[PDB]
RNA sequence: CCAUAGGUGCAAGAGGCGAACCAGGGGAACUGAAACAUCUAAGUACCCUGAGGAAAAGAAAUCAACCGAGAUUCCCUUAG
RNA sequence: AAUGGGUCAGCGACUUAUAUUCAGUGGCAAGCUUAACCGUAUAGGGUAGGCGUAGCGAAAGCGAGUCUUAAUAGGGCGUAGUCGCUGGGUAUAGACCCGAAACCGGGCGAUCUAUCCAUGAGCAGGUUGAAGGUUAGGUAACACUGACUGGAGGACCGAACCCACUCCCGUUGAAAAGGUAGGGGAUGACUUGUGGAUCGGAGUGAAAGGCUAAUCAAGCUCGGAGAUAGCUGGUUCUC
RNA sequence: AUUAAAAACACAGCACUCUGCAAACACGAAAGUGGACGUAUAGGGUGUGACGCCUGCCCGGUGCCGGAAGGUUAAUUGAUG
RNA sequence: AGCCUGCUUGUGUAGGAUAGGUGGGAGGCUUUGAAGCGUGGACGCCAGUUCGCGUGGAGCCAUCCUUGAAAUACCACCCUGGCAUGCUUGAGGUUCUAACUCUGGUCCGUAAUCCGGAUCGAGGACAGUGUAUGGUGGGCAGUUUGACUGGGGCGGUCUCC
RNA sequence: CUUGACUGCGAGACAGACACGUCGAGCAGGUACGAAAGUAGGUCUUAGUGAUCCGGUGGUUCUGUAUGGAAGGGCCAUCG
């Protein structure tokens, strides 16, 4: 499903209000793209689909602080 | 943002800190080893290797001086077709030209090239754009003779 | 080339069912408005996922006025 | 000569709860009364809260008065109750009972029928006779003629077989769609056996709004749901 | 299927138009499958309906195609008062 | 397009010229203003101006010498034509590979070519996908479309004197 | 000659389901005519028009969510 492998964002719902307030449903989908990330310790690319808000957090900690607690909640990368 | 480690780019320095786009540092400089993000944790170790940084800046240009005497020799004799006719009939090459500039030139060979000027026209010395840099390139001279 | 994927051997756990209760995910229409599009009906019916013998919630970046009250949960009033 | 009723015997229609107003009869009375909850529990405690004893004004405010106003003038308004009990009303819930066509939400169904898919077999007999080929002529040659063969076809007659054009009988039928006589196709755009695929604002359709289990201008079943009905029918002992 | 077998629907034939391949198009929240293990002498859609002789004028309305000069015109910026 | 800097540019009545100017400066002594003829430059609300002075280290506009609405020669502030180059930034154009893409080829997992991973080949900052916004949209849905009426449909009429 | 096409009112009645309606002596403010009694709260009378909610503009301490102010209300006047 459309979730992230760093931040835990899922699709939410809401409305689609018009100019006479005719409510109807839509979905809010998170931006998320495939991307490859180089590590140095295992010296190999790892590919994981992350949001654009996941790209900013990887720019904060760097790769391995976010890779380790992904393993420390028990996931495949 | 990042701390520069190379001197042969068009904005690089010895130890100057530059502010660049996020996609230019994420994708290109860091996964090769030409830069490092500025930190306040290992800064006692970067100051200890400043002597090792300037000895590395006195060796990369030293190997290039023993390298330019083998590239511009132009002794490569490519065996293409169309001996004495006039019409383009020779095997030009897009994958076999990387092995020809590596058996007697530089050994690196990887051609992900954006080009509408690839194959060459009627028999004569023309130019083929080959992998020479990482954000520019110019075309290398190719000698086309009979077979 | 190293060494990860991958493959076997063992240990421990889970899977299914059950009337209501609880917290989340998704969520109508008839009908009211003596018509009907905002609104009601209603976050109700139903459909999934969890867990417990209960759950959830809880120990102040809360409320009060210059007086003060000190966690949450539940019933009665403020008050239709 | 408008409706309903074959007769009998059983059952079959103004209810409840919470708020509030008016009357009847009661308790205490410028005061009357407690709700939760405690309780040796129908007792007792519990007066928080409510209604009253004073109004006028949109409000601050002022008060047997106050508002408007330049007003002190005029004028508007103003100078024995409370908690039970039993009745008549009213509000909100299915609200006196029975009765729709429809709409929405999870499922069941292509053993009939509509197209498609894989593997099977079925079509008595009797006619017609294309292209082609052979050979004889023929021609510079190819044309072109004859003879012998030959066996094409959404070809022709006609039974199993599939279908449904006419008449009569039947209509409480033998049959919730037949029968007896006659009809059309019958080697193919054929008929059919077994097994599978497509589903409800959705399929299939040589297209008629046709078929999807005797139901189809959007099935069947269980929930929302005792849907809504200014509309019909009924509403039970005496004076 | 069970009151309508037709002059209705089909049809071979004809024209118009879209589609250069990861095709137009359809079914699918999406992955993907048909098209098609095909490649413009192909594949979708719309009308007319073997054959013979033929198919006249109107580009104002509405639609599609072509063109940008100029006018108006969306969030986004935020001068100034 | 903002920015900078030094800014050197400033030609109408008319002054010898020339006015963006406000304060110092009465002249100005760095070859004095070397002059002066004429030297090029670019120059021009043009012969108007700046800089070389050919010579040669040679007096000049005159500091009201004038006149002109403000007088020079000199030091200060800024601005302009723009000069350059920078600093940033938009919009367009070309090219490059490293992101993303491949319903391409051959190895590996594998006895499978679905799916990965490795490497070459193509495209390449486009395509595509989130989120905000314009347009088209009976493809689809919820709904509306009055009464009186010598039957209702058509017509006539709905308020006031 | 002028602005009584005035401001605060209004005992009483007529009509009338209600909401709206019509006439009005007189009192107090400040005025225009006339020498002065006096007359003037539009036109000989009866048709010339549309509630509420919205929003817009002038006056307004009456409120102004701790306090001091403001925003936003309220009342009066007037516009679609």
């Amino acid at each position: 499903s459309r979730v992230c492998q760093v931040t835990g964002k899922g699709p939410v719902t809401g409305n689609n209000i018009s100019h006479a307030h005719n409510k109807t449903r839509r979905r809010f989908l998170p931006n998320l793209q495939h991307h490859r990330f180089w590590v140095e310790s295992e010296k190999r690319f790892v590919r994981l689909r992350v949001s654009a808000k996941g790209m900013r957090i990887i720019d904060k900690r760097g790769i391995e602080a976010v890779l380790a607690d992904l393993r420390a909640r028990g996931e495949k990368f | 943002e990042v701390i520069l480690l190379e001197k042969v780019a068009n904005l690089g320095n010895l130890g100057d800190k530059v502010n660049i786009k996020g996609g230019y540092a994420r994708n290109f400089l860091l996964p090769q080893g030409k830069a490092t993000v500025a930190t306040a944790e290992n800064v006692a170790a970067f100051e200890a290797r400043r002597a090792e940084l300037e000895k590395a800046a006195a060796e990369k240009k030293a190997a290039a001086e023993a390298r330019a005497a083998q590239l511009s020799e132009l002794v490569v004799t490519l065996g293409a077709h169309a001996g004495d006719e006039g019409k383009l009939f020779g095997s030009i090459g897009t994958r076999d030209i990387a092995e020809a500039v590596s058996a007697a030139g530089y050994p690196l060979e990887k051609a992900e090239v954006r080009l509408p000027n690839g194959a060459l026209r009627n028999t004569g010395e023309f130019d083929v754009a080959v992998h020479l840099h990482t954000d520019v390139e110019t075309t290398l001279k190719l000698i086309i003779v009979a077979e």
Side-chain angles (χ1 to χ4, degrees), chain A residues 18-32:
Chain A
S18 294
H19 298 281
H21 303 284
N22 291 105
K23 301 286 194 291
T24 175
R25 310 302 301 268
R26 51 89 60 87
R27 304 177 72 190
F28 288 89
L29 284 314
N31 195 354
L32 77 175

Side-chain angles (χ1 to χ4, degrees), chain B residues 24 27-28 94-95 109-115 131 134-137:
Chain B
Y24 176 56
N27 295 319
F28 181 67
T94 58
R95 189 174 291 177
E109 51 185 3
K110 184 260 181 180
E112 181 65 33
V113 52
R114 186 257 186 274
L115 80 175
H131 185 274
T134 58
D135 55 358
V136 292
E137 62 92 25

Side-chain angles (χ1 to χ4, degrees), chain B residues 3 11 37 46 59 63 65 68 73 77 80 85 95 100 121 125 133 147:
Chain B
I3 296 170
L11 291 174
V37 186
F46 290 106
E59 185 67 28
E65 293 179 353
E73 293 180 353
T77 303
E85 294 179 354
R95 189 174 291 177
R121 200 166 165 82
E125 292 180 354
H133 294 88
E147 184 179 2

